[PDB]
From a paper:
Eukaryotes employ numerous translation initiation factors (eIFs) to achieve the 80S initiation complex (IC) with the initiator aminoacyl-tRNA (Met-tRNAiMet) and the AUG start codon of the mRNA programmed in the ribosomal peptidyl-tRNA site (P site). Upon AUG recognition by the Met-tRNAiMet anticodon, a series of eIF reorganizations and departures coupled to ribosomal conformational rearrangements occurs, resulting in a post-scanning 48S preinitiation complex (PIC). This 48S PIC is then joined by the 60S large ribosomal subunit to form the 80S IC, catalyzed by the universally conserved GTPase eIF5B. Using single-molecule fluorescence methods, we recently revealed that progression of the Saccharomyces cerevisiae 80S IC to the elongation-competent state (80S EC) with an exposed codon in the A site for aminoacyl-tRNA delivery is gated by the slow eIF5B dissociation from the complex. Here, guided by the kinetics determined by our previous single-molecule fluorescence measurements, we performed cryo-EM analysis of the on-pathway initiation complexes to provide high-resolution information on the molecular mechanism by which eIF5B assists on the positioning of the initiator tRNA into the ribosomal P site and gates the transition from initiation to elongation.
Image processing and 3D classification in Relion3 identified a homogeneous class of ~70% of the total pool of 80S particles, allowing the reconstruction of a 3D map with a global resolution of 2.9 Å. The reconstruction shows clear density for a tRNA in the P-site region and density for all domains of eIF5B. In our reconstruction, DIV of eIF5B is tightly packed against the peptidyl transferase center (PTC) of the large subunit where it contacts the 73ACCA76-Met end of Met-tRNAiMet. The close interaction of eIF5B DIV with the acceptor stem of Met-tRNAiMet enforces a change in the trajectory of the 73ACCA76-Met end when compared with the position adopted by the acceptor stem on an elongation peptidyl-tRNA in a canonical configuration. Basic residues of the domain IV of eIF5B make specific interactions with this G–C base-pairs cluster; Arg955 of eIF5B contacts the base of G70 of Met-tRNAiMet from the major groove of the acceptor stem. Specifically, the base of Met-tRNAiMet nucleotide A76 is tightly monitored by eIF5B residues Glu921 and His924, which anchors the adenine moiety to eIF5B DIV. Intriguingly, this “hydrophobic pocket” is capped by a loop of ribosomal protein uL16, a component of the 60S, which is conserved in yeast and humans. This uL16 loop, formed by residues 100 to 120, is disordered in reported elongation 80S complexes, but is well-resolved in our reconstruction, allowing its modeling and refinement. In addition, uL16 residues Leu103 and Ser104 tightly approach the eIF5B residues around Leu871 to define a narrow and hydrophobic cavity where the methionine residue is hosted.
Residue numbers in the entry:
A (entry chain RR): 2 to 124
B (entry chain bb): 2 to 82
C (entry chain AA): 2 to 207
D (entry chain XX): 1 to 96
E (entry chain n): 1 to 23
F (entry chain CC): 39 to 255
G (entry chain WW): 2 to 130
H (entry chain aa): 2 to 98
The structure:
RNA sequence: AGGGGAUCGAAGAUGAUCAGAUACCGUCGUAGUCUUAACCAUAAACUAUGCCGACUAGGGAUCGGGUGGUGUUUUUUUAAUGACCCACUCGGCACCUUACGAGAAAUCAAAGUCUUUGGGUUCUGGGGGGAGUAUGGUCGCAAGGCUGAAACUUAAAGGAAUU
């Protein structure tokens, strides 16, 4: 029965997605971070919240875990998105390996297409 | 579908549609002006025979009757219509 | 009529049949069915590339007709079109629903995920049936990237493609983004195929 | 899609005979035709009747109610059947 | 009350009425 | 203090959607009752039924009050609203807003010899809901409304003057009667007559004319 | 056997125009069918129809315009009199303005509007809205 | 009402199926209706085979199996067999284990 | 509709489907009207110049809207060699 | 009424259980037919859906036929084949899976084309009981079958789905 409720597990997620820096894998510091940054009512609520931020910070440092993407990790996802390192090859302009077409797609491009160097195979 | 024009239908469909279930009732059977392996004649036979038809000189069995289109006698030449 | 320069260029035709948009196409088929080019032996179909391209130009004309850019909603809940619609949205401002669709998006005007499209672009009608079904309640046209055996229900202008390789989905999305950006946009020439690598649309595996 | 019944133009016999038969299942029709009013029905199928009162009766009401219904058993002058009539107001059993 | 044993009871008292009436 | 979501609301608030049939012309799904409030000021606001409906609970039986209400003009617009609320004073209100939202046009016509505005329906319409099937057989002039008193004033708020009815089924069930009567009244527009056989051009939607005067900035 | 041919022809046209199709194939195709189609065509409930003359009863291919809503036959051809046409065109049609009840009159296959202008009657074939 | 589109049965195209006795109840039930399940098992249980092999002649120990199709009536089957009466939703799911 | 005069007494003259000619109703949701852009010479189209094609809820639901617009496109010159009349 | 009668089993014997239990469980066990001739003529005799006919929208599988495979087997030289198998194709069959119309709904290839009511045609029902009872014919060796009421009684009985 040491299950944390939504009232701490949401506050924790809001806290980490805002102050990912100024949070250091240690309850004893994270406790005092919550003292300064948050206006938590009870001393025991703080201890539970801070104890779960620390649990999230330990888990986030073994590779990003789903549900909590912070303002830094979003920029990492933006770079892996835009700067996709699959741009050395053309690619898909595979003049070396489009041209392994079969007799049906041959008759297809013959009917409608202009003209293509076509490497015809069968079955 | 919704728009077809079944007055001018495509032959890729009319070929497959049943003998009756076409634009007009028309048979898919035909006649073979088939020539004897022995005494050369021009004996007209039918696609779906129903009889073991023979040549004129001897009883040289040109076809064997089957469920659909009839068989031929090991060696012979055929000509449709 | 069209000015008749958009006539399936050989660089686009070789892109499409290198992506294998037609070299699969589901052996078992739905009886619509005019986007067929004599199914190959060994149990596979082959689609008319001319037709899918013509349909793509028609689709572009409808998307380009939509006056405000981000009333076109680019949806792809399947993994193989996620970044494809994200890039489509970023290029031609077209708010994407890449991920879970959160039903009650077009109906249910209260929810924070409330969009009122005048067009939907759906990568798959089967796996994104919720988007189509919800569009039917609020009078929204839908442009689908269908296969041959994909369902046609509550779906106008369908672009016949392939939905097995991912190369197709990535390409046909790039090409639609390309053709819309030409008509009343920053692509000032129809020729010179605007070679921004069609691999900014390919779902890069982890 | 024939709706069961015949739809010939020369089927007036059948369409009439079928009603003549199936009308019997009606309640009003059957008893008007067999003359049930004139065999049963102590009144012999009439509005009122006259009679000479035999006994005063206290009939017990049916179950949801509870009372003594102050009836009167009366032999009909008309035919001679003995029926039980209700006295239709508060202190009228003392009047009859 | 079973519409079978109801029927059987009727069909018994009918037979025993036949045997009573044959006299 | 409307502050409308639903860009239909933004247009009709700005005072651009003229009055009122462009919503019906283009099948625009109206989901804000303050739209109808701005367009049509003169409506009723006439309650038909309040029946007690009872769910059986673990302990006791919870009774709600399913309120049926008709919100109609006196001209050519009616709306039927059925809402189940926990109180009758809240039920009538929560019904009225649905009866406003689901407002529908009626296609009034003649029984021959035009001579003035349409009085009856244009054609013999029917509508069905559950078992109750209502018919609206258009009638000669000055005959009055020849319906049950339930649907009589539904057709009065529709604005119909003369109409025979031939309602079959369990017509006592009031919700199913009015539902079927409201389908029948709606099905008038939906009959393709030689009166409206002429092929006219399709008008462009005001969501495509005032494209970027809606969607609040 | 099929008891009537106008019946299944008009049914087939109705079943197609329900789905908003643009053509029908009618297999039997009698002269009575063609003449009914011609009266439909006149008021403009029907486009054009071809008669394919297979050496038999032949067939028809009709083309619709989506105007026809209802199009039925009255199976037993009731002997109608011009004194009681109003009882039919009040029971079959939407009020009074449009629609036509088709009589096989001695003068020929006609509508109630035409039969009134001629002052003639016959039997009843069917109707079109 | 009618509970099943079938009749907890197959008989469609037939007039009468020759019946089968329930394995435990002895109740005669029409074959098509009877809940059939093949009981395929090793002759020796999945705990004894160690001491069986080590004390057996003929190394490679073929270890022949046993086969018998258990026909069950409906009531005998409802006694915690693969029946576990499922919802009016999951009634239609034909797929076996 | 008319009084056998002027003064047209008919509000909301409803717009018919372009595939079936069937009247679209006021509450007929799933009844889309697509606007195709009228192109200029090789690239851009005129903003505010369209060809407006309506398709009713019934045709959309049935799954013959792709085929209905394919034919309408070919017959207004928006496509070419897509809708083959005789299948 | 003749054979036959192994098994199983109305009746019955009998042991348990039971408060009683001439039942459910146990052991026996006549009649019982499985068979030949002659009767009987009813079943939840059910798809509880009359038949003949037309039109409206995916996959297997039975039977027949048409093509295709340079597939397997085929050896008596290459195989003439043939069969089995594979793909496309129809005609009919027993079906099944998804669904715009229908229905009170459960639901459905017809239960759709139905107040926008008519393809042909036969049978049956008109609240619940009394009652499938009495009576009278009819058939049967009998058991019974067919047809089949009324007096009187009653405000509901019933179908489907919901909590
Ligand atoms: Zn010779
Ligand atoms: Zn059992």
């Amino acid at each position: 029965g040491r299950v944390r409720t939504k009232t701490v597990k949401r506050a924790s997620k809001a806290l980490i997605e805002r102050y990912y820096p100024k949070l250091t894998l240690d309850f004893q510091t994270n406790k005092r971070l919550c003292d300064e940054i948050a206006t938590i009512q009870s001393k025991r609520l703080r201890n539970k919240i801070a104890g779960y931020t620390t649990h999230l910070m330990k888990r986030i440092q073994k590779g990003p875990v789903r549900g909590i993407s912070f303002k830094l990790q979003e920029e990492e996802r933006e770079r892996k998105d835009q700067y996709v390192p699959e741009v050395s090859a053309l690619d898909l302009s595979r003049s070396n390996g489009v041209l392994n077409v079969d007799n049906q797609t041959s008759d297809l491009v013959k009917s409608l297409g202009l003209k293509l160097p076509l490497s015809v195979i069968n079955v | 579908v919704l728009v077809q024009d079944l007055l001018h239908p495509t032959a890729a469909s009319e070929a497959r549609k049943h003998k009756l279930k076409t634009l007009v009732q028309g048979p898919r059977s035909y006649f073979l002006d088939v020539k004897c392996p022995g005494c050369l004649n021009i004996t007209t036979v039918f696609s779906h025979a129903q009889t073991a038809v023979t040549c004129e000189s001897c009883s040289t069995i040109l076809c064997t009757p089957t469920g659909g289109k009839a068989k031929l006698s090991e060696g012979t030449s055929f000509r449709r219509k | 009529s069209l000015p008749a320069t958009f006539d399936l260029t050989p660089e686009d035709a070789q892109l499409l049949l290198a992506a294998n948009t037609h070299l699969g196409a589901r052996n078992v088929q739905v009886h619509q069915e005019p986007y067929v080019f004599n199914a190959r032996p060994d149990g596979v179909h082959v689609i008319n590339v001319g037709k899918t391209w013509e349909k793509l130009v028609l689709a572009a004309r409808i998307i380009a007709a939509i006056p405000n850019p981000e009333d076109v909603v680019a949806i792809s809940s399947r993994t193989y079109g996620q970044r494809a619609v994200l890039k489509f949205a970023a290029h031609t401002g077209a708010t994407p629903i890449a991920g879970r669709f959160t039903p009650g998006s077009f109906t249910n005007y209260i929810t924070r995920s409330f969009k009122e499209p005048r067009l939907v672009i759906v990568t798959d009608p089967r796996l994104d049936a919720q988007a189509i079904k919800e569009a039917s309640y609020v009078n929204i046209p839908v442009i689908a990237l269908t296969d041959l055996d994909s369902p046609s229900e509550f779906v106008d202008v369908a672009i016949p493609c392939n939905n097995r390789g991912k190369h197709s989905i990535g390409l046909i999305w790039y090409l639609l983004a390309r053709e819309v950006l030409r008509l009343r946009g920053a692509l000032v020439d129809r020729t010179q195929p605007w070679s921004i690598m069609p691999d900014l649309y390919f779902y890069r595996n982890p | 899609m024939g709706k069961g019944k015949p739809r010939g133009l020369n089927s007036a016999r059948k369409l009439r005979v079928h009603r003549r038969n199936n009308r019997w299942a009606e309640n009003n029709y059957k008893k008007r035709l067999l003359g049930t009013a004139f065999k049963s029905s102590p009144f012999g199928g009439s509005s009122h009747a006259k009679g000479i009162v035999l006994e005063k009766l206290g009939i017990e009401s049916k179950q949801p109610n509870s009372a003594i219904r102050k009836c009167v058993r009366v032999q009909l002058i008309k035919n001679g059947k003995k029926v039980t009539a209700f006295v239709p107001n508060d202190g009228c059993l003392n009047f009859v | 009350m079973r519409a079978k044993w109801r029927k059987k009871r009727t069909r018994r008292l009918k037979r025993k009425r036949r045997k009573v009436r044959a006299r | 203090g409307w502050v409308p979501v639903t860009k239909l609301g933004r247009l009709v608030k700005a005072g651009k959607i003229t009055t009122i049939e462009e919503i019906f012309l283009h099948s625009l799904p109206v989901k804000e009752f303050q739209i109808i409030d701005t367009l049509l000021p003169g409506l009723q606001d006439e309650v038909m039924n309040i029946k007690p409906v009872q769910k059986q609970t673990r302990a006791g039986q919870r009774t709600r009050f399913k309120a049926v209400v008709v919100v109609g003009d006196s001209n050519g617009h009616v709306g039927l609203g059925i809402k189940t609320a926990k109180e009758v004073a809240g039920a009538i209100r929560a019904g009225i807003i649905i009866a406003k939202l689901s407002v529908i046009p009626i296609r009034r016509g003649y029984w021959g010899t035009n001579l003035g505005q349409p009085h009856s329906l244009a054609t013999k319409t029917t509508g069905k809901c559950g078992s109750v099937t209502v018919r609206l057989i258009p009638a000669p002039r000055g005959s009055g409304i020849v319906a049950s008193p339930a649907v009589k004033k539904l057709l009065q708020l529709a604005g119909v003057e003369d109409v025979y009815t031939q309602s079959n089924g369990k017509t006592r069930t009031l919700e199913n009667t009015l539902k079927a009567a409201f389908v029948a009244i709606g099905n008038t527009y939906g009959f393709l007559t030689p009166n409206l056989w002429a092929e006219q051009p399709l008008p462009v939607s005001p969501l495509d004319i005032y494209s970027d005067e809606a969607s609040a900035q | 056997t099929r008891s009537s041919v106008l019946a299944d022809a008009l049914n087939a046209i109705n079943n197609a125009e329900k789905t908003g199709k643009r053509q029908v194939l009618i297999r039997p195709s009698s002269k009575v069918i063609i003449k009914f189609l011609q009266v439909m065509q006149k008021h403009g409930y029907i486009g054009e129809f071809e008669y394919i003359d297979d050496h038999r009863s032949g067939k028809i291919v009709v083309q619709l315009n989506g105007r026809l809503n209802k199009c039925g036959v009255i199976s037993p051809r009731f002997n109608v009199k011009i004194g009681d046409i109003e009882k039919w065109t009040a029971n079959l049609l939407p009020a009074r303005q449009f629609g036509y009840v088709i009589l096989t009159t001695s003068a020929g296959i006609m509508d109630h509007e035409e039969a009134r202008r001629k002052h003639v009657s016959g039997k009843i074939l069917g109707f079109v809205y | 009402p009618k509970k099943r589109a079938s009749n907890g049965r197959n008989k469609k195209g037939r007039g009468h199926v020759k019946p089968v006795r329930c394995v435990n109840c002895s109740k005669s039930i029409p074959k098509d209706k009877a809940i059939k399940r093949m009981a395929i098992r090793n002759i020796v249980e999945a705990a004894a085979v160690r001491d069986l092999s080590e004390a057996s002649v003929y190394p490679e120990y073929a270890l022949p199996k046993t086969y018998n199709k258990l026909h069950y009536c409906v009531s005998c089957a409802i006694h915690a067999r693969i029946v576990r009466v499922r919802s009016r939703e999951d009634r239609k799911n034909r797929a076996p284990p | 509709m008319e009084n056998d005069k002027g003064q047209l007494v008919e509000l909301y003259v409803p717009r018919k489907c372009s595939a079936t000619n069937r009247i679209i109703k006021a509450d007929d949701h799933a009844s889309v009207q697509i606007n195709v852009a009228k192109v200029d010479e090789e690239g851009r189209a005129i903003p505010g110049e369209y060809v407006t094609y309506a398709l009713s809820g019934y045709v959309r639901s049935r799954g013959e809207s792709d085929d209905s617009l394919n034919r309408l496109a070919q017959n207004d010159g928006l496509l070419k060699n897509v809708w083959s009349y005789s299948r």
